[PDB]
Amino acid sequence: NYVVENPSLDLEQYAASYSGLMRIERLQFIADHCPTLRVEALKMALSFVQRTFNVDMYEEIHRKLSEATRELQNAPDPPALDTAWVEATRKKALLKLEKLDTDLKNYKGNSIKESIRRGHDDLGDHYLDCGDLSNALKCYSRARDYCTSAKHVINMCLNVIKVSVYLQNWSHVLSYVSKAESTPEITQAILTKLKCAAGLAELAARKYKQAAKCLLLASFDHCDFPELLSPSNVAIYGGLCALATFDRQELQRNVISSSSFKLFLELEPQVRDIIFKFYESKYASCLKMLDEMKDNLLLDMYLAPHVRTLYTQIRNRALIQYFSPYVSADMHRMAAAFNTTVAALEDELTQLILEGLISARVDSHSKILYARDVDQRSTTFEKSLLMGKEFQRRAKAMMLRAAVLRNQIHVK
Amino acid sequence: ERQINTEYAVSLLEQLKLFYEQQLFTDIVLIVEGTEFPCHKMVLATCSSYFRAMFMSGLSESKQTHVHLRNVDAATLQIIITYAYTGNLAMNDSTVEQLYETACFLQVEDVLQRCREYLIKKINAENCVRLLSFADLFSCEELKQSAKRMVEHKFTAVYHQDAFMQLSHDLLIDILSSDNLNVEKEETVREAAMLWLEYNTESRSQYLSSVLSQIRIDALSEVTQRAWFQGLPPNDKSVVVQGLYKSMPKFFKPRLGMTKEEMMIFIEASSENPCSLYSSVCYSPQAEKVYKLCSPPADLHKVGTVVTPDNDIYIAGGQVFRTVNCFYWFDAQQNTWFPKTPMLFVRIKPSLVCCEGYIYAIGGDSVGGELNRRTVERYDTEKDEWTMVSPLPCAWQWSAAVVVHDCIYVMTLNLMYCYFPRSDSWVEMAMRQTSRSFASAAAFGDKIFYIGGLSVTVEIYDVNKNEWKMAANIPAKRYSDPCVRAVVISNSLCVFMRETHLNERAKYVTYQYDLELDRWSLRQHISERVLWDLGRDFRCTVGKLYPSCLEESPWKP
Amino acid sequence: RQINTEYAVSLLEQLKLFYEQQLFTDIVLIVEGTEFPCHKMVLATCSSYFRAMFMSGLSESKQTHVHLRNVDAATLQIIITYAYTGNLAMNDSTVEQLYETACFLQVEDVLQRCREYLIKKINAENCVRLLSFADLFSCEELKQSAKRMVEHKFTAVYHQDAFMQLSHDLLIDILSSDNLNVEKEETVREAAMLWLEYNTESRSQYLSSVLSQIRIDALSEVTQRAWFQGLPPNDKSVVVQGLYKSMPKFFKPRLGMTKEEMMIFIEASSENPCSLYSSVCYSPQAEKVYKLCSPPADLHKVGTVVTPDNDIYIAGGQVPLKQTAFRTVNCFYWFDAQQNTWFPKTPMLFVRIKPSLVCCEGYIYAIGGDSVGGELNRRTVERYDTEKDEWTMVSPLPCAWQWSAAVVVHDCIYVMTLNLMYCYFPRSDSWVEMAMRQTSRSFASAAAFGDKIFYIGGLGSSVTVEIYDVNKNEWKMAANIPAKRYSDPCVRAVVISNSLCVFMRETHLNERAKYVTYQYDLELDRWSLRQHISERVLWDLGRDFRCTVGKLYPSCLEESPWKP
């Protein structure tokens, strides 16, 4: 699976780039999946978790930090939660929350749709601050009723998208992205935020071809988008998905035409080199860097399971693209076109031929990969004869069926 | 005793409000200059300490359906009645005086306390003397004393308010004879009394015989008598005799306001007792002594400091480490911290800047997750509220901000933006040739001195010239990391730097810098026998404090 | 806004203080010489009569002394204090007069509270009294709630003295209703006859109407000359009248004669995957599978009992707390044989999981059931009172047992475990040691047939049968049930048609479950094939399903639509 042992993560930048519950979940993911660095990740997590009235997840994080500190007290041979925080946090949280509940119930008795919608959004934000997922949803799911303006609908969609990411109800995200896009007549770049929401939601839904297409349409003018995904990861997410799905012509057109992914490639020069090396047929340098970035994003919140399939697809596509211009390519040179061994490439090539889309034959005598260019006519005639034989067999079958049905032959 | 109120308390006062608004079960009606207020005797008894006697004494008032209550405002009684029917006051900022007057007349204790707490918290800039007379008219000792100290500072500050002219004799004697006058000179109180006495006629001349003797004798032998000769009624002989008697006696003693020594306020120092983390201390440039200050929250740290031209200290933001948007103000005499209106966003190390009487907080990790992370928020020292202003142009961290020529200037790694308060917009300024952060700037005269950064970079900027230039490098010992602090002192630019080496103790020394010499002359070296180590996250600011109110910090040399 | 809670109680306690300390009193209620100093405010806040007594403009509007008549001092005092402190202490005796004064004063809130209490208090011994009370005062909701409970409980008892003192209109509604639960149409006939003969000729005019609601299968046979004996002398307007009167009114059988012996099943496999489990039933005579109402709040891990009066009760169980999530609750429910719904009853003291519900002497006994306590007495055996609607603890069992079954024989509780057995003596509340089984088997069920205990199966289960005799106090083997080899039969012991039958579902290797029941010959010690349940009507039920013997009405229930 994942949970590997990799050094060199920059905790300060990754924590500061995100903000909110999005930051909290990522810090929890980093700590749980990266040992030998979990303590500082947990120490930084609990330092930020106590801010903005966390109740249930604080107990889980504090318990994990207490276990982590206890582990450090036995290897080179547990912090107090300061329960006064509970007394302080609960009394403060309740008082303002009831006062906010106080004010909104006045507006329910005053009957103003926008005021009711705005108050419930504040209640939803407060519940999210208080650490109440479903409670925030119901406030948002009853503020959706009292909408009056298109911007109010846009704000309603954004709030539901934000919550459903935490709830992992990505179906609700995609539905509200479609509602927020298709309805209002397809400087304020609002569609860019919606496209970013769809791209990450699709990627979390094990979708790659649409996620890359949506991510490539995201303009860099959005800049600060920390509640869902940092721009640095967006560029990484877009580049990996484009590499696995977009072909060479598809890659070149979309990257250049977007003119925002060029900026995204500037933030992440590593993935930019990958596509350029992918284009110029230097898959040896392309894949060695790929493993270097692998360990880094192997501890990414919504990438770790998906990227393993993405990287496997990248290796398959690179091999297909490499051998495509060659009718007879030496397997030694193809093996030398990566750090892989001769035997390992032969097994990988054999697997690719079994799956398909390489159309090649392996001459293991001299270890030379000869491309298969079978004439269309021979295969056409063979499969036409097979089709005729199958048609004759099915004709005999239906002939027998008609005979037995006309003669009323059946077991009583 | 079992006094459960879950879904049972509301039901009663739900009905009684419904019964009141529908005019049901009413047996007593209040006539208020022709306005009828049908209500109940029982609700009035539990709320007002006067209505209980209004309906219980064996007088004819008990057997009277219509009672004509006068000297009460209809609106104030109605808001009192509805508060006696729903428990909610919902008081405004204008009708507080009349509401308190009617509450005192009706002896409604709960609303009296609520109005007292509202009044004690809303003495901002102008109503101090007005409500002090209101507190003098109706005994509100807790508010009276709070207003007394508040008036003492503020009245001395303005000393031209028209509301001060009308006052009782006893209140003026308490104000004027007190030793809490925040005045650096003894003649400003003299002329304030003179203008107060010349405002009216003989009736005030009777009070002149008692108020003239509450000032130190240095101002009673002055031109006061010479100006009194033309202002005295004719055929007055004995009045002159008693005036001559007020020269020698009555214990001429120094005041307290003259002890406004210009000092340096420090925060987050190395605490002596290990049970405490940080502490706030002060240093006296002239007295060469180290004073201490009480921590405002006593548990929260990472605060920002600002000093208004009127020598006021404010604290905003910080983390307990949960971030709290609380606000506090330092008392110059009580050595305490009175909280104020909190901010709407929980900031980490905010940078507060004062300009045009408004406190501007620039940056400092607002919420971090803003759609526009580059925002600022200002404070109103008069209205006591926070007003949103134009957001920041660019994202900056560990930045500094100063005020020059009534304009807001914020400094970052290499960029600078000037905020125009009149139009509420940011304007592009000069770009610095060196990228340095983790440093602060000082607003001395018409020049901004950005000192330090990562060092000893001295980059001087002029508003009138709009250019950045180098002057020199501070003389510091090698193999060290100096902690530079630039601040104005005695109308002269000076620095406060500490050098730390390997296996060596920290040394504190301040230098005098000259504009045309580009050299930091040795002004004074702070001896370690009086000042100990401060730390790394300490901050420095300049302001006036009182040695008597504060206490010396005990520490072994 | 919601109005403030803190000021509400502070004013509320001042309402009470001004009442207990007689100060602001302007009106006093004069009731049978008892002084009631109070206020015009509080009295009419709850009462809708005092608002028309004070704010009406009559003589009392100024008069400060009112002589309230036809009321009770205790009822007025509790009503007055309830208006002042909000506490309504309702006992089991004064609720009758409480409703009388509540209706007289038209006080809406106490009327609802006492009505709800009477809805909870309706039972067998006061059904006639409450229905007449619900007829005296229009309380339609209670009247309909009573009438349904009245209809079933009259037919069972039909001997209460208050039945004689009933209005003619009420009796006509009761007798002509199609909700009566009677094994025969003759018991209602004689019940009407004794009611008519209870009094003098005042019942003669109602006799022309009461017979107009009864079927004609007894309006020509016996109990016509008996009335002629009881006829007033020389009355020639009745004997001839009834002679030519019983032509109309459409003979039709009633509904109470449709209680067939059926096997009630609980926690069956739900057909629709949206629900966890369901409840079904098998018809040994109709050969169909009728659906039943779901357990209350999908109450799983429960126990069933059927009293000799043919009543179904549910105790114990757990509800999924709001992935594994389940919390145990001690809620109790009663099943309505006609409305196809579960009426809630008084909950137990401790929560139970799979409790053994056994009825004896009218008391429902729940033995064990994985209680929450777990103390030294980790059994928590407790009986239920069907008379007072309450639970009373009984003598604890000598030993701690798990996955046990209990039956009732000879007015005694016989609970069985892996190898031990103890008999509970309800008259002295003591336990006595019984015979010891020679085989260690658990997860089985036992059925009480006559004076013998038949422990069928045990451990899947097997075909081992150990027969115990109460009079002999010994465990003996009889035979083994002939079943297909390499299978896991699910045995279910039950008594039906005055015989010991077994509901055994067997599953072969890689085969679907097959349903078949056998009749065990008591004298021949052999299981005979009584009937084979075809799979076209009965589908899979599961493993944790329970079976019990009882009677249900096919008319009120509906056939379950499901593919064979």
Please check whether residue C352 is in contact with residue C371, taking contact to mean a CB–CB distance below 8 angstroms: yes
Cβ–Cβ gap A224/B367 under 8 Å: no
Alpha-carbon gap: B15 to the closest alpha carbon of chain C (Å): 8
Least CA distance to A107: which residue of chain C?
A: C1
Please check whether residue B49 is in contact with residue B104, taking contact to mean a CB–CB distance below 8 angstroms: no
The amino acid occupying position B164 is: F
Residue C9's contacts (CB-CB under 8 Å, 6 or more residues apart) are B3, B5, B9
Alpha-carbon gap: B20 to the closest alpha carbon of chain C (Å): 11
Token representation of residue C65 = 């002394």
Report resolution (Å) to 1 decimal: 4.2
Tokens 């659906």, residue?
Answer: C291
Angle between helices A21-33 and A56-72 (to 10 degrees): 30
Closest CA to A261 of A229, A220, A290, A300: A220
Cβ–Cβ gap A224/B322 under 8 Å: no
Cβ–Cβ gap B45/C51 under 8 Å: no
Chain B residues with CB under 8 Å of C11 CB are 12-13, 16, 43, 46
Cβ–Cβ gap B319/A224 under 8 Å: no
Burial of C5 (0-12, 13-18, 19+ CB in 10 A): middle
**CB atoms inside a 10 Å sphere around CB B218:** 11
Size of interface A-C (CB pairs under 8 A): 6
**Nearest-by-Cβ selection for A224 from B322, B323, B372:** B372
Burial of B529 (0-12, 13-18, 19+ CB in 10 A): exposed
Least CA distance to B6: which residue of chain C?
A: C5
**Nearest-by-Cβ selection for B371 from A50, A51, A224:** A224
Chain breaks in chain B (C to N over 2.5 A) after: 320, 454
Please compute Rg for chain C using Cα positions. Answer: 30
**Nearest-by-Cβ selection for B369 from A85, A89, A227:** A227
Distance CA B119, CA B113 (A): 10
Size of interface A-B (CB pairs under 8 A): 29
Alpha-carbon gap: B24 to the closest alpha carbon of chain C (Å): 8
Chains in contact with C, counting 3 or more C-beta pairs less than 8 Å apart as contact: A, B
Least CA distance to A108: which residue of chain C?
A: C1
Please check whether residue C349 is in contact with residue C330, taking contact to mean a CB–CB distance below 8 angstroms: yes
Q: Which of A81, A129, A224 to mutate to test the interface with B (most CBs of B within 10 A)?
A: A224
Size of interface B-C (CB pairs under 8 A): 73
Tell me which residues of chain A have a C-beta less than 8 Å from any C-beta of chain C. 102, 105-106, 109
Angle at B363 between CA B359 and CA B368, to 5 degrees: 135
Cβ–Cβ gap B370/A224 under 8 Å: yes
Please check whether residue C301 is in contact with residue C318, taking contact to mean a CB–CB distance below 8 angstroms: yes
Distance CA A62, CA A39 (A): 11
Distance CA A236, CA C360 (A): 75
Cβ–Cβ gap C2/A105 under 8 Å: yes
Cβ–Cβ gap C2/A109 under 8 Å: no
Closest CA to B373 of A226, A187, A232: A226
Chains in contact with A, counting 3 or more C-beta pairs less than 8 Å apart as contact: B, C
**CB atoms inside a 10 Å sphere around CB B109:** 12
Please check whether residue A83 is in contact with residue A64, taking contact to mean a CB–CB distance below 8 angstroms: no
Using alpha carbons, list the distances in angstroms from residue A194 to A125, B213, B341, C338. Answer: 20, 77, 37, 57
SS3 state of residue C417 = coil
Map out the domains of chain B with their CATH numbers. Answer: 6-137 (3.30.710.10), 261-552 (2.120.10.80)
Alpha-carbon gap: C10 to the closest alpha carbon of chain A (Å): 20
Cβ–Cβ gap A224/B321 under 8 Å: no
Chain A residues with CB under 8 Å of B89 CB are none
**Nearest-by-Cβ selection for B322 from A16, A50, A224:** A50
Residue A97's contacts (CB-CB under 8 Å, 6 or more residues apart) are A126, A130
Distance CA C225, CA C430 (A): 55
Chain C residues with CB under 8 Å of A109 CB are 1
Q: Which of C1, C2, C3 to mutate to test the interface with B (most CBs of B within 10 A)?
A: C3
Least CA distance to A109: which residue of chain C?
A: C1
Alpha-carbon gap: B117 to the closest alpha carbon of chain C (Å): 19
Chains in contact with B, counting 3 or more C-beta pairs less than 8 Å apart as contact: A, C
Q: How was this structure determined?
A: cryo-EM
Burial of B20 (0-12, 13-18, 19+ CB in 10 A): buried
DSSP B118: H
Cα pseudo-dihedral B430, B434, B440, B442, rounded to 10: -50
Least CA distance to B374: which residue of chain A?
A: A224
Cβ–Cβ gap B88/C12 under 8 Å: no
Least CA distance to C3: which residue of chain A?
A: A102
Chain A residues with CB under 8 Å of B87 CB are none
Cβ–Cβ gap A51/B367 under 8 Å: no
Closest CA to C336 of C129, C148, C562, C90: C148
Chain B residues with CB under 8 Å of A20 CB are 368-369
Please check whether residue C217 is in contact with residue C184, taking contact to mean a CB–CB distance below 8 angstroms: no
Distance CA A253, CA A255 (A): 6
Give me the residues paired with residue C443 across strands.
none
Chain B residues with CB under 8 Å of C9 CB are 3, 5, 9
Chain A residues with CB under 8 Å of B369 CB are 19-20, 23, 226-227
Chain A residues with CB under 8 Å of B395 CB are 224
Closest CA to B42 of C362, C541, C40: C40
Start-to-end C-alpha separation, chain A: 56
Please check whether residue C371 is in contact with residue C349, taking contact to mean a CB–CB distance below 8 angstroms: no
In this structure, the strands spanning C65-67 and C27-31 are: parallel
DSSP C203: G
Tell me which residues of chain A have a C-beta less than 8 Å from any C-beta of chain B. 16, 19-20, 23, 47, 50-52, 85, 89, 224, 226-227
**CB atoms inside a 10 Å sphere around CB A145:** 11
The side-by-side arrangement of strands in the sheet containing B447-451 is B440-444, B447-451, B458-462, B467-470
Burial of C46 (0-12, 13-18, 19+ CB in 10 A): buried
Distance CA A134, CA A128 (A): 9
Distance CA B358, CA C498 (A): 97
Alpha-carbon gap: B323 to the closest alpha carbon of chain A (Å): 6
Residue B414: its H or E element = none
Cβ–Cβ gap A19/B372 under 8 Å: no
Alpha-carbon gap: C4 to the closest alpha carbon of chain B (Å): 5
Closest CA to A150 of A141, A142, A158: A158
**CB atoms inside a 10 Å sphere around CB A300:** 20
Distance CA C446, CA C416 (A): 8
Please compute Rg for chain B using Cα positions. Answer: 30
Residue C188's contacts (CB-CB under 8 Å, 6 or more residues apart) are C155, C175, C180, C182, C214
Alpha-carbon gap: B178 to the closest alpha carbon of chain C (Å): 43
Closest CA to A48 of A78, A11, A84: A11
Distance CA C270, CA B62 (A): 74
